[PDB]
Amino acid sequence: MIQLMLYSLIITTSIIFLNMIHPLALGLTLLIQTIFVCLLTGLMTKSFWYSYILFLIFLGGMLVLFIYVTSLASNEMFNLSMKLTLFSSLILIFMLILSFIMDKTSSSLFLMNNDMQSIINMNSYFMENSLSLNKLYNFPTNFITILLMNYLLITLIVIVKITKLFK
């Protein structure tokens, strides 16, 4: 089933992550991890709003730095090993068959997706992000957003102070 399969894929990729040493191979590994984690948090959330968000910030923009500066390339390309792939396939499958075996429900989270809320709940019949993101802007908990944007402004003042060492 999707949820625990997604655990399994994250476990397998994590084992891949701790083995790989080529920087691209690691950075590639992060990329897959991010899709998986976005999928997983989405499932247990009220909706996928935050998943789309952190996708485009974390992965879409910010992993570009990591791959780009890790374009050192090692001066040479991968020597891919079909063995860790086969073990990855092998470990995936019997984890997957166990996933078919494991208890259908109890092996699932308990969080309350929009569907898993009760019918009577008059609040749930609004736009899915309306009531969640309300107090990010409504007082008196919105000034912290102002702190975020100025933090980012200051972050740029810092980057031009570190990235401007005589060139």
Binding site: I53, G61, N142, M149, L152, L153, I159, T163
Partner: protein, 117 residues
């Protein structure tokens, strides 16, 4: 979602099958020492050719991240505008954009893209 997930898996599988198929459809040739060299307009490639990483492109992409995150902050304004208190939503959003402009215009007078190098 998983309807989307399955469709993407199906497409990707069909995609790799097509490229896998073309890999057998295309005739093979005995490999050649020179057929597998980097293309440098027909004159021998130099030493490793790994480009220098002393440059600005990370700096531009860092500007991307700052504005990319700031974009994240302002995305939800569409929905909350019907619910949030109007003063706070009004002023709060307005100062976001205002600070952005002032950062931009202050930064033009800085002119940071017109680097000496």
């Amino acid at each position: 979602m998983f309807s989307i997930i399955f469709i993407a898996l199906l497409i990707l599988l069909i995609t790799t099958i097509v490229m896998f198929l073309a890999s057998i459809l295309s005739k093979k040739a005995l490999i050649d020492r020179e057929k597998s060299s980097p293309f440098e307009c027909g004159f021998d490639p130099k030493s490793s050719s790994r480009l220098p990483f002393s440059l600005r492109f990370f700096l531009i992409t860092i500007i991307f991240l700052i504005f990319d995150v700031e974009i994240a902050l302002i995305l939800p304004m569409i929905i909350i505008m019907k619910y949030s208190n109007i003063m706070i939503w009004t002023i709060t959003s307005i100062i976001f954009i205002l600070i952005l402009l002032i950062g931009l215009y202050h930064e033009w007078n800085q002119g940071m893209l017109n680097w000496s190098n």
